[PDB]
Design a protein around this nucleic acid. Sequence first.
RNA 1: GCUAAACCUAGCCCCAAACCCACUCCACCUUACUACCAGACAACCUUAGCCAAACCAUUUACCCAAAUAAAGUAUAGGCGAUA
RNA 2: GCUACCUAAGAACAGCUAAAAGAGCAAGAUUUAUAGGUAGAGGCGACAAACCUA
RNA 3: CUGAACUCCUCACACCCAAUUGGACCAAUCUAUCACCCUAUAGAAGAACUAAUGUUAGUAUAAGUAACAUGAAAACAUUCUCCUCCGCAUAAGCCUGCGUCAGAUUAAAAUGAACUGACAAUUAACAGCCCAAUAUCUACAAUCAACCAACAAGUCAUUAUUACCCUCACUGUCAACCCAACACAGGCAUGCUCAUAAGGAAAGGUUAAAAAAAGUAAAAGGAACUCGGCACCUGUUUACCAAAAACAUCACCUCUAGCAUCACCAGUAUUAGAGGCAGUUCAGCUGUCUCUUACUUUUAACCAGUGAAAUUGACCUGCCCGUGAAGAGGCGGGCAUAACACAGCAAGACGAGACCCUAUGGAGCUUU
Lengths: 154, 166, 236, 46, 110
Amino acid sequence: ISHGRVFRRMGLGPESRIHLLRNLLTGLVRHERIEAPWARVDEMRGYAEKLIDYGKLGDTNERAMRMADFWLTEKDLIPKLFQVLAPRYKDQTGGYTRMLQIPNRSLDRAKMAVIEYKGNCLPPLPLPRRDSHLTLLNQLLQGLRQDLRQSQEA
Amino acid sequence: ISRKWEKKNKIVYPPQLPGEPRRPAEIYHCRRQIKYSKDKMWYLAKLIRGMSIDQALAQLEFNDKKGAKIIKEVLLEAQDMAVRDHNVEFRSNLYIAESTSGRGQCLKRIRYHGRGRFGIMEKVYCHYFVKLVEGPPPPPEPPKTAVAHAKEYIQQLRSRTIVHTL
Amino acid sequence: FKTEKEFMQHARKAGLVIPPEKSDRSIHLACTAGIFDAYVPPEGDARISTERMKKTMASQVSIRRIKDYDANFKIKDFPEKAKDIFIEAHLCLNNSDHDRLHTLVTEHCFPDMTWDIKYKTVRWSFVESLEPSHVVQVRCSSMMNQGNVYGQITVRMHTRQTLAIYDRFGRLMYGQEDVPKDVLEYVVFEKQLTNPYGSWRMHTKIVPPWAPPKQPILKTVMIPGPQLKPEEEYEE
Amino acid sequence: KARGNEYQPSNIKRKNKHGWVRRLSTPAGVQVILRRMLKGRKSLSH
Amino acid sequence: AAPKNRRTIEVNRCRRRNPQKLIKVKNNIDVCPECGHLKQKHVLCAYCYEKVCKETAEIRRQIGKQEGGPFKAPTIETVVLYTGETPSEQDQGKRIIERDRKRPSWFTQN
RNA sequence: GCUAAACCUAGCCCCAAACCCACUCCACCUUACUACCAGACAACCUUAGCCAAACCAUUUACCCAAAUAAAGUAUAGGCGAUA
RNA sequence: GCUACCUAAGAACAGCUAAAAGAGCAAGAUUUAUAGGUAGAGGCGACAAACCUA
RNA sequence: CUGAACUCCUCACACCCAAUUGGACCAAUCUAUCACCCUAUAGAAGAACUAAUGUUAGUAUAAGUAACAUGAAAACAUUCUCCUCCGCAUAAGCCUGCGUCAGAUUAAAAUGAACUGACAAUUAACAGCCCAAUAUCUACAAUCAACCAACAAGUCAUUAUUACCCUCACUGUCAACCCAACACAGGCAUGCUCAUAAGGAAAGGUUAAAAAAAGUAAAAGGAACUCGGCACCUGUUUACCAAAAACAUCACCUCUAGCAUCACCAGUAUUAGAGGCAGUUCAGCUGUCUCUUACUUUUAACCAGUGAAAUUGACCUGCCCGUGAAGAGGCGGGCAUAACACAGCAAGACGAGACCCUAUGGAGCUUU
Ligand SMILES: [K+]
Ligand SMILES: [K+]
Ligand SMILES: [K+]
Ligand SMILES: [K+]
Ligand SMILES: [Mg+2]
Ligand SMILES: [Mg+2]
Ligand SMILES: [Mg+2]
Ligand SMILES: [Mg+2]
Ligand SMILES: [Mg+2]
Ligand SMILES: [Mg+2]
Ligand SMILES: [Mg+2]
Ligand SMILES: [Mg+2]
Ligand SMILES: [Mg+2]
Ligand SMILES: [Mg+2]
Ligand SMILES: [Mg+2]
Ligand SMILES: [Mg+2]
Ligand SMILES: [Mg+2]
Ligand SMILES: [Mg+2]
Ligand SMILES: [Mg+2]
Ligand SMILES: [Mg+2]
Ligand SMILES: [Zn+2]
């Protein structure tokens, strides 16, 4: 029974799980786009979002610096977090990362995901795009919406 | 060993008379000594039976099994061969007439057991056979209807004879 | 790798030192690779139906060499002889009479004639000869290895032929079974003058650029565009 | 606790115990060589 | 427990060929609009993704040369500039990565 | 349709007839196949048990110069087996 | 070349009470490398009738 | 009236008893002579296989099951996380066994490669490999060797005369390595490092069922309920907290022996050898238990790769009662019943799994 068990069991145990996520998070901050097994990227995505929130507290904040020190193994990333990533998202209240499933990797056919920090310099990922408004179904719904405006106005 | 499948493409038919309906082209292709078990390969060969060449390629492309890539290459080779050497017009106008796996020539290796017993492990190989036929996929036979069932049952009653008498 | 250089480059990269072989025996060739002096068919020849003297003189020099090996040779008889060889060779295609075909055509011609039709059915017939065939050119090679001297005679043939090629399944893929069509062909004939058993055999055909495009094929064809890797971008 | 490791290789022991000179040292050992010669053994002794 | 009897081929076919054992046909396959290759509806196109990764790898190799060592992550934003392009006013005061290539059509300067 | 199947030689057996073998160079009884130092060690001596006696306790066989016959006879033997 | 015993010539052993040196906790009737010896009617055995390359 | 292989009827008629015997026939093979799309008459013989706890080969079943494997990201440069149980060297063993190039071969892995082909390599100072004769010499341990001590009494040495003028050969030198076991199960001498400057990776991916293994935490109680919790000297042995017994052995006792050039012993009755030697309770703590619960890891299940074995007469493999039946999936009566995966379970089938007497057989050992 695993009712309400939010966290996955990974690696060699609890401590190993955090270190596995920390290594993935450290790679994401440096590269801004990494690809790994889907479950691990999904497990790490929450920490990636929360790390940006600590970066918004500022480097002067002692608790935030302690968080960045632990979660960022490579210390040169800590300045990047507070001075690059955090200011980038100053306006946004969330949704810092986007996660997309990519084809299963050849060796073990593991389900794979790509996760990136929105706004990176890297070439854009081929995001899924909703159908054009000009399509037949959308045009029929656009006409319906316009009529409901006239009826509402009356 | 036997290699009859390769020779089937060498059959030459007499020129058809104008009245005769155009005979659909048939392409036979296979890959020998694949490093895979025929048992595992059978499911992949079964899956694409009766599919169009494009539908079979699509299903195999997103199949995780190792055999799927091998069969997909054989299918692409057969499709290219059909148009180039067998005078098939449209490459898409092909369907999987026959798709089967066959036991290859296997290698026996000395293996070991946890208590020191001596064992023979076989390194399994298999063959994949495909036959492509020109034209659209034959429609799947529909389900037997209630009307068909009733007709069959009444036919059985009508075929009854007085048994063991003059 | 198919090329020999790549094979020997792979062999030196594999340490497979292949020593060469010297023997008294060598491959015995009954024909040559190509035409000794290509005969450019004058443009407009089909339309009709000092340089000429110089070219004719070369044929007169060559015809003497042919007479030396075989004295009882008449260039006047060859057009009729060549016509018969041409018709017999093509008739062998109808019934895949390869052993007979080998006597009528050289080892250079044989692959071209029969390779493509290995699994096809060919129906060919010589309906008529529109104008008499005449020997346009006569050439003769210089002394080659093994003392082999070859003589090549080019004959211009304007004839009416019928060709229908069926595929491996009996379905018509080219031509019409009975409709006669007009064909102008320049056919080079070769003979090993040194060989005591050499005979005049069809060697090759000459295709001038002005030649009209051949009959269109029945089926449609798709010429695929560049198959590009993900990084490579298509460029018009 | 170890099993099947009776062999503790020693070249000095192997030559002294089963060597050519040892076999010739006694008449029984010489007959050992003679039997192997008769059988056509590739190795008459260590 | 050892098997009591050999299982017949008849029985084994029923087990091995049961629908539960057969590969299911996939209905979520589609054609990618950009490249025309096949993809699943919920998965990124393999052909298009590899194209992005190839260019991303070249850019990362260029970033490595500029950094010229480990633990040298910059404290400013990065901008990629292709041949024939000049730094924008917005893209000023940022690390500039120069690619000896024309900007890909899919990669749009912002 | 696969896996496979199929094959005719390599040689071998039993006789006959004839009495066989073996030092290119170099190395080889020491830890053999190891160029080159006072040796000393020297071989010879009933085959046994046992096939069987339904056990076993004396007891039976494996060679000595011509096929055949004398003859399974004379003879030996818990006078039994058997020889 | 296992093992038992033996021969030759070797080797190893922290701290702690520490008089006494002792399987005290953790220097001995200890452990251990090398070569050699004892052979089945036998050998060897702080003797289990054990072991002597199953 | 029904109801046999009895009897009749039409036809046929030598055609249902083990061993055994008698008389015919006969597959294939070889030989003589025929024959000549596969035969005949004879002669001969390695002459016929559903009955094997038989041999060899092929392929099944179990089973695509059990089981096996690669720390993370990335620019593949590098960095990060964790482990260290080691590591380096010598000896011994081993003998080219992850160097280059190539490969169609190989590991889960179509870079790697320890497999294949070719090419290359370990260089002596270290180490091994030693020495003229004849006589003669060699009482005093080691232990920081000094002081104080001992007992089991000890690895360390010459001279005389004669002889001798010559020189640096030969061999070992590589490796991810040996003996094993086939989940390191394990074994392995010495020096140095004493926690590493050297050497390494527990997780193929996922899910987070049971059962199982290990670990951690646990209300109240604190061994309750359970075969049994936890806290005449010396030496080996099975067992281990151990107890016990056995053997050994100091001491003790009797027994035999008056002597030397292979043991006893280079000893001599104060010697030598052979024998015998007759702690509970209590208090305290604990998932042992009342009475189990939670979590982590492994296993597990699913995906992908690779891929065993025991077993198997055949199988279209139900329940109840009856039948010797508590000997029935298969027989009698009755009942039940469309087909077919996967995960569990362990009632049955089915399997993994001492004692008896008998045979005109042995072997130790004990003697009446
Ligand atoms: K080795
Ligand atoms: K709990
Ligand atoms: K019953
Ligand atoms: K059971
Ligand atoms: Mg009767
Ligand atoms: Mg027989
Ligand atoms: Mg099973
Ligand atoms: Mg498993
Ligand atoms: Mg593991
Ligand atoms: Mg030296
Ligand atoms: Mg070395
Ligand atoms: Mg290290
Ligand atoms: Mg691992
Ligand atoms: Mg896991
Ligand atoms: Mg796993
Ligand atoms: Mg408690
Ligand atoms: Mg009690
Ligand atoms: Mg108590
Ligand atoms: Mg319990
Ligand atoms: Mg699997
Ligand atoms: Zn695409």
